[PDB]
Write an enzyme that holds these catalytic residues in place. Structure first.
Site, PDB file in Angstrom:
ATOM      1  N   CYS A  80      -0.162   3.637 -13.166  1.00  0.00           N
ATOM      2  CA  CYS A  80      -0.550   4.122 -14.404  1.00  0.00           C
ATOM      3  C   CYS A  80      -1.564   5.349 -14.593  1.00  0.00           C
ATOM      4  O   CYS A  80      -1.016   6.305 -14.557  1.00  0.00           O
ATOM      5  CB  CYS A  80      -1.220   2.779 -15.077  1.00  0.00           C
ATOM      6  SG  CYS A  80      -1.272   2.852 -16.969  1.00  0.00           S
TER       7      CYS A  80
ATOM      8  N   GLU B 263       3.270  -2.130 -13.931  1.00  0.00           N
ATOM      9  CA  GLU B 263       1.792  -2.954 -13.627  1.00  0.00           C
ATOM     10  C   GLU B 263       1.653  -3.939 -14.722  1.00  0.00           C
ATOM     11  O   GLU B 263       1.932  -3.667 -16.055  1.00  0.00           O
ATOM     12  CB  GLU B 263       0.745  -1.667 -14.003  1.00  0.00           C
ATOM     13  CG  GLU B 263      -0.767  -2.008 -13.933  1.00  0.00           C
ATOM     14  CD  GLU B 263      -1.595  -1.119 -14.412  1.00  0.00           C
ATOM     15  OE1 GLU B 263      -1.151  -0.318 -15.510  1.00  0.00           O
ATOM     16  OE2 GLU B 263      -2.632  -1.025 -14.156  1.00  0.00           O
TER      17      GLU B 263
ATOM     18  N   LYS C  34      -4.604   0.736  -6.690  1.00  0.00           N
ATOM     19  CA  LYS C  34      -4.791   1.811  -7.865  1.00  0.00           C
ATOM     20  C   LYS C  34      -6.125   2.605  -7.228  1.00  0.00           C
ATOM     21  O   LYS C  34      -7.087   2.142  -7.143  1.00  0.00           O
ATOM     22  CB  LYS C  34      -4.888   1.357  -9.311  1.00  0.00           C
ATOM     23  CG  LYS C  34      -4.706   1.757 -10.678  1.00  0.00           C
ATOM     24  CD  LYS C  34      -5.465   0.883 -11.863  1.00  0.00           C
ATOM     25  CE  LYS C  34      -4.842   0.301 -13.003  1.00  0.00           C
ATOM     26  NZ  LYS C  34      -4.801   1.228 -14.090  1.00  0.00           N
TER      27      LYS C  34
END
Lengths: 340, 340, 340, 340, 340, 340
Positions: free
Chosen positions: F166, F59, F134
């Site tokens: 993440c 990312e 995300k």
């Protein structure tokens, strides 16, 4: 005493430590430029770490190591001075306290005696509130003039702080002295070169434990032309457990929250491993049970310390018999260091 | 300073440490029977470890912990006595030195004062050559009367040995005192119960490093009705690196060779991490370069130690302000331990 | 065999290993410029490490990997040559021995056959005293022409040294060959790329143990456009315990002292894990007790080695049945590598 | 090659290894009784581990170490014999293969020569399919007569197995010999005493890697009157990564699934770390690129191995110059082992 | 949240976890006798750990695993019953809360349906305040009837507690469910057999982190005739850091202090890793900045959970396509478990 | 599922993960230039890793973090767009699939709503085959608009892949959702800043285990002016064991082979730790033995999930009582984040 978040609360001091890449500088202008880089880093870090209350940079992070003696004298700092003003502005802008390194700090007899190696604690108002001079230079290589004093200062949120520098931390006595003066956090700033990586990671944890104190270590990284610095900046709890630790990476950061109430609750209520209390109350249970009152024994039972305090020359003579009589050794000579 | 073989040479002392399973005993006859088990173990170990010159057993390995006060007094030992005679015969038969634990050793005012907690070093002739009484009992639980003295004794092959017991080792001062009296090996015998496993493994390594000394730890194992003992008996080099370490297993053994010439060569020729030398010669390079002669600074710069030596009561008062004023805490009361 | 100091004594060789950042170069002039950077690094390191007697750089540290074939041939070195002269001057100025990498070294039939991948050991007088050519290129990617010979050379303070290169060290046979020729230190220089980090850290330690030899590893770091190199340069004792180890950081350094007397004392007096002795005296106790004399058995009991020595083609045929018959595999083709 | 489940599939062999507590026995009847305990353990383990196809017990797990020579001779086993019959019944009842230890196995000249130290592989039909005698006794203490032969046998699901015993595994040559004969699993059974715990954990992993082979280790635990055995039984993948490992605990078990197709796919298609292939095809890329055909170099380049094969006496003489000339050392004498 | 002392304060709950050696029992009388052994252990532990407020025993620690079905039914417990009365007396005498295991607990349709596998939380008054039945039996081997409910109960000092059993903890959902019901401590009691040691040590730490909860694990040890249990009982902070952990040793203990104020302060003031809060407020910053109000998004975005809740049969069908359709596999059959 | 080679076979997907140094960029032209650097890196890596089938970047690796809001909007990408075209060309030239990060991706209402934070999976033909936004932004700092959907896509050699970003990975629910949709590999791309290094290394391994899935993590490195990123990119087996892991080094790479047949064989034939199967078949053995048929229990027993699915607002209210009611906290305010 908790790790993983970027926040902090009224109870916790948010501490960041920086694996600052070691500069290799030569001039005053270069030193000022790097001071401004540190300032910029403080301000940026605060944008990412909104809980940050204290930021800690390594020994030598402002100047690097001034191997050239003329450059050492030419770049030695005044405190307060231009460098500390630059740091103080960052502390104000980022609303943080900070620990910064001036290597050298002009001796009172500058330029006719070696500079000190010095740390400052600057508050969130920009005020210098502690100035600590390395008591134990990393001889033989370190040529700094030794300081003589440890300090404890009220820090962010009232956390009591002492500063120490790099080789100081190999000597348990300094950690004890700071804790016994009331330190709740001992900050060890260092430019700790390879070889002794694993030993230094272990010493900081052991000293957190032994002195029931939080510990923050900021260590340099990178290669500077002479040394490679091993990083492993860290924050350690008063129970000996690491909070967070960096690796060897350049400009690594660690960040942890250290609870004011927890260390105070421990120091009041811990029993079996309340080391500070117990050292001055030895054998309390046995004395109570023996009809001898209820405080244990305070007297120092260790002849080394009694001799060192009474007769430092004798203690020195004694250790020379165990080690060597001269500061140098002819099996590994170093220019300027006398040997037999 | 080398690990993995069963041999030893003229240069190395072969040290074995024993993770002895903690006994849970009640009578003098039971104590004698277990003493004979330890003797048998020494003799058997020597058949497997032909290099063994020193064997080390944990604190409490002879008696276990005598929780019952009447049984504590009834089983408290004389030194020399029957138990030490049994150990001495094993040392002679196995041609080894040994470290054994008498818990209790009768007080001079027995049975009207608490026993001591004592270690003996017995040579390969069966002679008791050091008798050390725990200076720092593990209060509050430990009811032993505190000792007051550290010792250094010439050991196998001339290796200089000091003995310490369990909680002693949380306090860097004792390790320093022994090393500064000339110890080359500090033996820490312990019945170190959970919780503090990882902290104790780390302390021994840190103290080996800080004092440039070999360290041997013998720790108990098993559950005795009250405590579980975490083992991790170990032998550690003067460079802070473990030689060999046990796990938590009952009657684990470790064995390592510690070089006499290596520690002496280090103490003569090491420079940056010659901690014993450097503590009494601070800042030598900077003083030389500043026109101030060639010994560095010996004086103690740490007010805690000066105050503790001059005015132990003041040092005690000072620490009570940081911790608490009474030996007990009302938040976790213990019968017999006063609180506020 | 001790770690943490910067000194060395008459008994110890001070070894530094360098996590040298992998260059990505194209021209002879670039190679010379980087050779001068290595020279400068040697001289600077000596100022920080006064005990340094031997400094070790990775495979490829002078040229990097010359992926372009024309550039490979254009930059292939003569030995002695300009690069080695630059290194030799550094060894003289820093009063150290050094190990450096020439990748390639011109083949005798240059430019009509692939260069060798070569290490030199240069003494503190600037003299090349060992030249080792990689016996086991890291095929398929490595296109270097294989060498055929291991060497042992008297090193600093008389420490006997052998050189090996990167993939060589996956094969226990080379370590054995060097030790059995008398090596006391085996130096493994490498540009060991990810993936196999943990496996390579383990192999060096295992080989130190198996061959009762000191081991020094210098491994590259950084990304060079093709590979990332994992560092973990190290110095390992003959007992299998690491002295000091780097991480993955660019231009990390480790430094340790290896005792000449300790390895010689071990090799004379170790018994249960005197691997070099025991391999050629198998079952000595059982033969003595069986009335068969007092040397054990020397004969090689392993058919692989007898076949490999007698009939390498047969050994090759045998392994092809277990693995594959062609150097390439059609499931993962590589240009220039034939498959089925 | 996967860890954590109790199942196994047509592709995987379910391997269990046992940290068997070391017996301390004296009579044939005691040995038979303990054999029956092992049998019972096999059957119980299968009820918990339905995927189990192979169960592995330590060296000495049937007899313990017979320190008394008369008892050694009196309890030495025939193979096949009563003990193996007891084991074979368990293998049939539990539908598993098993590896068991007979220490001693009567010599052909029993009782006039020392027994062998032997392992058997028994199939799920109760048939003994491999019998391996320790080639490298753990001298000086081990008095067993040395064997001379390694074997490979088709195992459960066709997995090819070789057996080795304890000290054998310190010598990379044996692992190589087995792999080069086609072994896919090397089973190392041991009663490996402290001190050398960490070294033995590392050796097994390194040898799995170096020989691209699965490895299973069963190691004893406990104290037997002479030695403490460190456990850490394990199963390791051909990529050097541990599958599962025990600690030092008595009667620990580990269990892992080793894939037949994965090791065969690796040995066909691996390239950079296809060690078995590459050792006999050195420098293939460089030779291809140099106009020299497409097989690399097979010839053995290591003089040690050529000399050992041609002239074992010379190899022995050579190593005696590096180590010592007699099997014993006068610095650490052992009865029955001659020295100078 | 601190480790190493034996005390506890008004702010901390002193938690002990026990590596209880797995019994191998057959009769009700044997079960009662072992219950009394556990009671005795509680009382003794409190004498050594004056801060202990909660003591936790493994799954199966009272009965062991009743492999024989008749013995399983004959020893299945009532709750409350005789066993819980014995435990309750210990909790009162030691002034502690405790977690104990009843395996089995009679089904409502006993003996015509399988028993439950049950934990009780007993307060310091002897009252049963939580009774939890294993929701996820360790099938295929575990034959217990599944429970259906998680609970949260006010514990010592007001610390909110949930109980879970062994295999439950492999499923993150249960930990989430407990935390989202308000648990501050999740207690995982287990008889977790080898193989999956390292995986279980990791799962508990990961779940402490993921759910911002303290975690206490009590795991069995020893060999019981079928399984070896790997211990590693532990107490873990809500920040994912272990407080203290046992090894594999029989009757190991760990003890830690968990702060009530710290977990509550974290859950109020943590931001980046306030997982409980953030899961139900996704993307709050982005929605605020996008003009969409200030709560983030609560809706569940994960189809698995929506399907499982709406249509469990469909979720089951879906997973059968990924895995298998029958509870058994013909490649590793188990009596009583159907396969294809 | 094997580590150490550079090859791959028909059965294995060769996965590389990159510790990409975090850029600190400001303009579209800078972003394109860095995209081309990533492309060049892909092509070079393939020359060193001939088995590479999938390459994974962190990312933020294309844009870095666009802290300046105007620059965030000015550099937000279209997908497909210029950046993805550059990546697609590299995937074609290197004959690899790749995972790349677009931070931001223009919102449908751009520039009037925050961009998404997006990953693409690009095949070896250059085609975008998954685009994942995300779901769990790292609030409070992350200002990206949340996505709402997970995906599974057929990958190289048919390996089924899901992408996550993440902070997503702190929430076990997402990993479960992907696995239950059929993912065999979950790729977690991240710019995961210090502090939470050790917690993130552990989470990925725990989730591999819990979901019986391969996991690949690519994490950024370096300091970007605000954050230091801790690296430790990794590839993890479905059994919870790491294959290979990077350190904190800039532009580290790891590479591992993940077997298609092994994960499918596990998911069919594993029993005790077939977590996906077992969650939807709870208590099957007990129900069979209780006369209740042979599927176990599928119904969700966890009220949190039922409430979250039925009544997300209620679940939100419930968690606010445990944590706080506002997205901000006044003890650590952040501009733009409301508090009480």
């Amino acid at each position: 005493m908790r790790h993983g978040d970027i926040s902090s609360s009224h109870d916790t001091v948010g501490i960041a430590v920086v694996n600052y890449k070691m500069p290799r500088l030569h001039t005053k202008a270069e030193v000022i430029e790097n001071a401004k880089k540190i300032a910029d880093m403080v301000v940026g870090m605060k944008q990412g770490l909104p809980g940050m209350d204290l930021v800690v940079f390594p020994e030598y992070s402002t100047m690097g190591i001034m191997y050239d003696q003329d450059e050492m004298f030419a770049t030695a700092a005044s405190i307060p001075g231009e460098e500390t003003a630059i740091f103080a502005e960052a502390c104000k802008k980022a609303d943080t306290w900070g620990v910064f390194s001036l290597t050298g700090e002009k001796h009172e007899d500058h330029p006719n005696k070696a500079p000190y190696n010095t740390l400052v604690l600057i508050n969130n108002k920009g005020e210098i509130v502690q100035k600590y001079r390395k008591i134990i230079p990393w001889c033989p290589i370190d040529g700094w003039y030794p300081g003589d004093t440890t300090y404890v200062t009220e820090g962010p949120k009232g956390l009591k702080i002492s500063l120490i520098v790099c080789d100081d931390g190999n000597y348990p006595e300094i950690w004890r002295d700071c804790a016994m003066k009331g330190a709740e956090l001992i900050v060890r700033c260092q430019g700790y070169m390879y070889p002794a990586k694993e030993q230094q990671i272990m010493m900081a944890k052991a000293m957190a434990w032994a002195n029931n104190t939080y510990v923050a270590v900021a260590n340099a990284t990178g290669f500077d032309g002479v040394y490679s610095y091993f990083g492993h900046s860290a924050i350690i709890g008063f129970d000996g457990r690491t909070l967070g630790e960096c690796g060897t990476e350049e400009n690594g950061i660690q960040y942890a929250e250290v609870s004011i109430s927890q260390i105070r609750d421990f120091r009041k209520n811990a029993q079996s491993q309340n080391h500070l209390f117990k050292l001055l109350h030895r054998g309390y249970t046995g004395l109570i049970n023996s009809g001898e009152g209820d405080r244990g024994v305070a007297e120092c039972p260790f002849d080394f310390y009694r001799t060192w305090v009474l007769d430092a020359e004798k203690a020195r003579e004694n250790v020379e018999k165990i080690t060597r009589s001269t500061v140098g050794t002819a099996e590994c000579p170093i220019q300027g260091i006398p040997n037999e």
